[PDB]
Amino acid sequence: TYKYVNLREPSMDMKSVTDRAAQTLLWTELIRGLGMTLSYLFREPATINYPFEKGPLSPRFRGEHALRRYPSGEERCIACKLCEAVCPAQAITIEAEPRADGSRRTTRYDIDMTKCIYCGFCQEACPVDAIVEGPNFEFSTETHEELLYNKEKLLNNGDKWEAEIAANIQADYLYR
Amino acid sequence: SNLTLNFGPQGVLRLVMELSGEMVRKCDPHIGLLHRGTEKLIEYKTYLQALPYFDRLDYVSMMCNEQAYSLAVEKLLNIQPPPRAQWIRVLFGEITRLLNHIMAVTTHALDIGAMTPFFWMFEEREKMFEFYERVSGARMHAAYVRPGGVHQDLPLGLMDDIYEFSKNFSLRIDELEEMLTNNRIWRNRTVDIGVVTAEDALNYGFSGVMLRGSGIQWDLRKTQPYDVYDQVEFDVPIGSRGDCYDRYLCRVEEMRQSIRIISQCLNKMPPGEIKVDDAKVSPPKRAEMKTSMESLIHHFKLYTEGYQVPPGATYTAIEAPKGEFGVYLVSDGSSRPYRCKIKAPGFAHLAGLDKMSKGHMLADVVAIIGTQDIVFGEVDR
Amino acid sequence: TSVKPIFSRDMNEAKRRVRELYRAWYREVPNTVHLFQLDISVKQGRDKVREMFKKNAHVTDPRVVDLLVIKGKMELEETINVWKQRTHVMRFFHETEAPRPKDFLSKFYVGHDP
Amino acid sequence: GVRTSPTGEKVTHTGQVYDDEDYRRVRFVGRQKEVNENFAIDLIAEQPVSQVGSRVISCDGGGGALGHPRVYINLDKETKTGTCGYCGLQFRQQH
Amino acid sequence: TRPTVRPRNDVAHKQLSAFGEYVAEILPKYVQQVQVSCFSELEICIHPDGVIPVLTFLRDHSNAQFKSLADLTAVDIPTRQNRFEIVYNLLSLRFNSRIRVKTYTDELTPVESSVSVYKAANWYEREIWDMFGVFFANHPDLRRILTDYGFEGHPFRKDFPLSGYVELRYDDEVKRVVAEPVELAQEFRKFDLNSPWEAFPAYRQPPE
Amino acid sequence: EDNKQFFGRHRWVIYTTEMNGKNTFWDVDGSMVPPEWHRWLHCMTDDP
Amino acid sequence: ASATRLIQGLRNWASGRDLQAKLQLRYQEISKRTQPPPKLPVGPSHRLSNNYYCARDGRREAMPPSIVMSSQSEKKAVSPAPPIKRWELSQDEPYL
Amino acid sequence: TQLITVDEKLDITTLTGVPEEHIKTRKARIFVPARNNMQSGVNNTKKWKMEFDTRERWENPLMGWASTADPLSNLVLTFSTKEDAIAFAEKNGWSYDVEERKVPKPKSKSYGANFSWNKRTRVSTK
Amino acid sequence: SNLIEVFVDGQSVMVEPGTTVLQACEKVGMQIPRFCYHERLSVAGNCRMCLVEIEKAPKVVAACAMPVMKGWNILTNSEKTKKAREGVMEFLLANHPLDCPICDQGGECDLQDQSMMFGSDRSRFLEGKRAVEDKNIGPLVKTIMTRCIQCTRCIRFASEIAGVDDLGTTGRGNDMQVGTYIEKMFMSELSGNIIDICPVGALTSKPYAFTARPWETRKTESIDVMDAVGSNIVVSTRTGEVMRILPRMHEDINEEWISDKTR
Amino acid sequence: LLKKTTGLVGLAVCETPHERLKILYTKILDVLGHIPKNAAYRKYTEQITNEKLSIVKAEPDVKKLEEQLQGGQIEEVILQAENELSLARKMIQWKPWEPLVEEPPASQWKWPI
């Protein structure tokens, strides 16, 4: 159940001693290393042509946050505050009140994307699939406060990315 | 008089060297440059919320530290994962072991000067990060291994790709080993370097390869076994001289034996669920959260309060690729930990750095900091 | 009410340790201003060391002043050995902080803090 | 259904808009105030009241496990529709 | 209780109970309690004067042979007059076992350093100085290891706040990173998550 | 597409020269891909 | 997989290994990115009878630690376990 | 011997590293917390708690968040008895005030009192 | 004295004659679960959540209304007690609506908390649920009667402490509905305290509705100044803004009630 | 048999392990005789040392002595006998057979609090 690495004794006949001296004087394993590097010279490299080629992803990928709507335009979020209760970074801040038709909705839904650890506990705690961590990873900003999303930015992320978010949830919800 | 150098932070490490010309008389590693106060932030967060901190301790051994914390919490909860979750944990723990030993060997060669097998083996490491992203959605910090099992079942066609990876990965190990093992320049940088006796290795709190390079026959997957490591068949590599070269060979052979374990885990994956079927610990399915009243109450209370862990203290140690990774978890009966000490192997290894670099030279210090696979996230917490 | 000592048996051995620590700091302050190339005078650094010693002058417990001498030794070790940078030395001089309001009336003006 | 303050600044679906004398409009000077133009309170008012022939109706928001938790709505009031508390859809017994 | 309940190991439980009797009767001078948890882990609660005699016993006695120091830990419990609880996790490779050795101190009583027994402690209890303020006597190099150099206070004490008292920022007047009193743009939101119903009747404490 | 290439090269995009009022002849940008093509291009699905 | 047989033969000679059998670039042998939908199994507690939670409770069968010795004959000297069984050498590849 | 005698009051205020602004100005409230009247369970009324007076919370100019400058705003300490909390507050130089534990007084419950012959305590319905 | 000895899980306790099983268990620190029992209302005995085994007795008894006899050993943790609790919690959650995200009582719900502590972790209910018509009892109490579990703390409070006699149960069986039977506006001077004693989200606070959530609120203990009674209150706040006012238990002032102006 | 290496780094091969273990075990018993009889350490250490010494005196072979001493290689059995000897020499000075030096405080090991 165990094996000894590096517990070989070299032979001491004239054959193997001359083999080790030929390896010393003729640099044979160094030529072996040159041969391996020369072998990789004549391979196709693994390099994709970004931005024109993209690395392969899965439908479970956890990128930029978005707030989804029902297929009637009504937003799914009903202010239950499970997502800021489970948020390990406390990146989510929610404030709510009943709006003009009596619906339980949020007035504040903020996600500090610089606090966020992108672990997706908010999408798996959400009982109505409102907050999702969608596919977008190319949302780098030139300013720190541009990574402090309010509810309007997250609803625009949902309206921007719903055509892809709904297909990823369709491909993945049976594992959940 | 004698020379005193400060190899500063220009992970990261400050080193105060007392040299006597070319020799090294004293090596003082000033650390704390990545001390973030993890195990104080754990105290104000629930057990599920404290789980993603363990991804970021040994940030090349993510699912291993997830597994150690999950085993600590499941030990205090007196529950056990389903068998399929156990085989998935051992499978991704050995994939994590391949990740960590590629990082270890290729950066240990990069710092010495062999910069090429770095690029050769990070494509394989890129494919294993695609396996992590397919199983969890993130490439490094998955938050996948949870107390109760894992978060989500394997997507269909993942095991065929783990097969296609594992079929070809031994040739990658062979061409790494072609570049470095019989190479006389690599041997001249690692043979007489940092010889650690077995008694001082037991005394200094060393663990893993740092013991097994010195001939100590100790592996926690054999002696104190966890999830299904008593059901897989593998060998434990043992060194002979306690140097950097034996520890290199032990890590290459642990890549070999991890490929062996991954083949056995692909051939022996059982059917079944992946969480514990106690819905007071692991959350219910989303189809039954949205239909059952008990399951909605349990979803609400697990994702807001969390499960209450019974009061007690445990030290749960697993065999992470850097060695014995331990969690001393103290629970006061609430849904948040009272205390979580994180034992990591690199802390005791970097404590023994000063003995290992006595009588050596300045360019041997980088070889000794390489043979102890030191990730400063796990050292400084 | 019988406790185990740290180094001192009563207050006089502790004042001996405080006195030798103050001597070591008083000798160190010119080297500290020199090699950190600080913008303070040597007299001003010595006044800061006098202020930091007189801040804790009310302590009548031997174990507490034992731990204060030990922590002053650790600060002096981090000062002699160049482990601190210029920023760590100058954190004793709260320069960029605003002057805090002292009387009742300005504290009434600026906020709610007593 | 957005509207606009007399400052020219757009009004959100909450009803938030900065005052005329508020300095915090200087963050929108040279830039834009990002509001969403699809107000959910206006989009849910466009949906027809579903006429059903039962006394108690159920709603899951559509999709089954893709919707909300399934709730039951009593339809005993002929004066008023029975609105789903999650998705905002509303129902009426047809008799 | 077959699928979902962790199985009890009564063999290791009886063995650790016998070895706890063994350690309690060989060393009655310091051993104050001996307890075995329901998941079969042994704790030896000793007096702080016997840190060196207990740890050298378990390291050297041929039935113990606890050669490895896995972990060294302090726990802050402010409701005790000896608030700090020093935990030694020991590994025997000969008998494949683990033992916990627990002692106690307050802020001012020093604990004797176990670097004579296990040199691994040379950083660990050094960490306990940086994090908890527990002084260790006869330590070779006792100083801070994890916090910043001018840091006042000990962070893992539970009367110490989650954030510090000072925060750093670069100031351009003095051309220097400076420390200022901490002011958060958003307060850390304390959640009161404890359920008011009793979860575990086995751990019920008797009332007054 | 080109299913003879290896996995990663087998799907690609040639960005337009003008999108939303910006001359993207040289300033090609990763965020120019609309989300219906973002599953196909990032291989989240097999289906265009 | 697109290399001509001259470059392929030079590459296999320079490496010394058969590289087309084990290529580190992935091709059509991988899984499809679009999969048929799963049907995940229920666990053992998904039953309608004999399924009381008081017979499968884990957190409430855990006990406080049993106090062996507290301060409020010719018995055998004991160890915390029997001594560790000596590891057998591997039969697969012991390097011996 | 190796044991000294310190008859002084225990005081660690110069060791804890707290700035003086948050020592001699803060008032620690030591109390058993009241039962949440939304609920009927009493597991939160078992332990003594030490909290502090609230300081100023204000609105963030950027996001509208609750900015604070109080480092001790989230500090809640748990104690088994009142005397441990008093000793811990005296040890740390914190001025304190102690609210006594309020316990519910024993109630005389009779189900038959709902159905009396001549008393006012009959229920009108059930 | 005249104290009779009873036993709770083998532990002896000395109780007054007339003391129930639930108070005898309270005297050793064990809290029997309950929904309809409240220590200031009359005893109803009609939710059956307090069913507990007395040993050498082949029937669980309602602990809130059963006086102890001298010599009983109350098994608060035995097998048939826990089976009684799981069965009663299954029937309570049979028709209860899946409204926990849209309910104000979530995070502070008795039905949630002791469904976690004492209920089963899943459902055997494969049927449709009842849905109850909502009532209108004023601008203070939001009434969502689908969430009602029919514990009749409404009726006992309005009948005994508020002295109103305008809440009651109309109907019979599963169709039994707590309400007023007419559009009557329940406006007492103590009309908000039924928000306190309702163990579920059937009666919530209408001004407090949807705004906050009880885990994120900081609880500050304070004094009422609306009247000269001196009622002990908890002001619960959230991010520097006052969210609501709750009573505190003071046995000599406001026992656990407050007036509607205070609330 | 002349075992070429022990396997453990820093531990050289002892040529005559039997006489070395006999000398170390009799020296352990000679140092251990200075402990009072009512101490449990003396009785337990005499018991295990007499078992080990009877096993050493029973077997002429080194390797079967390794398989029946049940302590690994014979050289780390020698090293553990040296550690036991130094331990007994410390235990004479410590005198830990005495009663408890101090009762703990009342809630010192009560968990949870």
Ligand code: SF4
């Ligand atoms: S992904 Fe995680 S850290 Fe980010 S908002 Fe969601 S729960 Fe919070």
Ligand code: SF4
């Ligand atoms: S996003 Fe989801 S979890 Fe968060 S408050 Fe809204 S409905 Fe609840």
Ligand code: SF4
């Ligand atoms: S009353 Fe309780 S169980 Fe019912 S919906 Fe509200 S929180 Fe959930």
Ligand code: SF4
């Ligand atoms: S509304 Fe509430 S208090 Fe009234 S009977 Fe129903 S559950 Fe009880």
Ligand code: FES
């Ligand atoms: S509590 Fe006794 S039956 Fe309701």
Ligand SMILES: [K+]
């Ligand atoms: K209520």
Ligand SMILES: [Zn+2]
């Ligand atoms: Zn709906």
